Write a protein that binds this ligand. Structure first.
Ligand code: CL
Ligand code: CL
Ligand code: CL
Ligand code: CL
Ligand code: CL
Ligand code: CL
Ligand code: NA
Length: 129
């Protein structure tokens, strides 16, 4: 599913991501834009042989099981395919665990390089939230 910007903002807000660990909704929308272009089906292979899955590009090295990332963990206790669903519940639940890990949203490289310290409020402009 390719979400619209405000559709995704509303879904993230409903599932409790707005101000989760102190990160306003625009941070999460910005991260999704640059990680996945709002496409739940996005997958990208990493150099180390892990893969990133879904709207927030969650890595099989630590967070989900894809059966092909040797020596990896499954800390969200989910198949990585669950992170590709049209329903973002699994991705949001796992992202809450990731952002609680101690480095906040720096876990998302595209957030750190493209969203951090920018006007992230712009990402929820016009949305009826
Ligand atoms: Cl914001
Ligand atoms: Cl497996
Ligand atoms: Cl594996
Ligand atoms: Cl959803
Ligand atoms: Cl933080
Ligand atoms: Cl500034
Ligand atoms: Na894994």
């Amino acid at each position: 599913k390719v979400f619209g910007r405000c559709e995704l903002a509303a879904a993230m807000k409903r599932h409790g991501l707005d101000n989760y660990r102190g990160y306003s909704l625009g941070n999460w929308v910005c991260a999704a834009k640059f990680e996945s272009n709002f496409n739940t089906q996005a997958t990208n292979r990493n150099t180390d042989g892990s893969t990133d899955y879904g709207i927030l590009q969650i890595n099989s090295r630590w967070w989900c099981n894809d059966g092909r990332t040797p020596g990896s963990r499954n800390l969200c206790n989910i198949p990585c395919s669950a992170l590709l669903s049209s329903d973002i519940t699994a991705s949001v639940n796992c992202a809450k665990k990731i952002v609680s890990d101690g480095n906040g949203m720096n876990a998302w490289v595209a957030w750190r390089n493209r969203c951090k310290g920018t006007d992230v409020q712009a990402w929820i402009r016009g949305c009826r939230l």
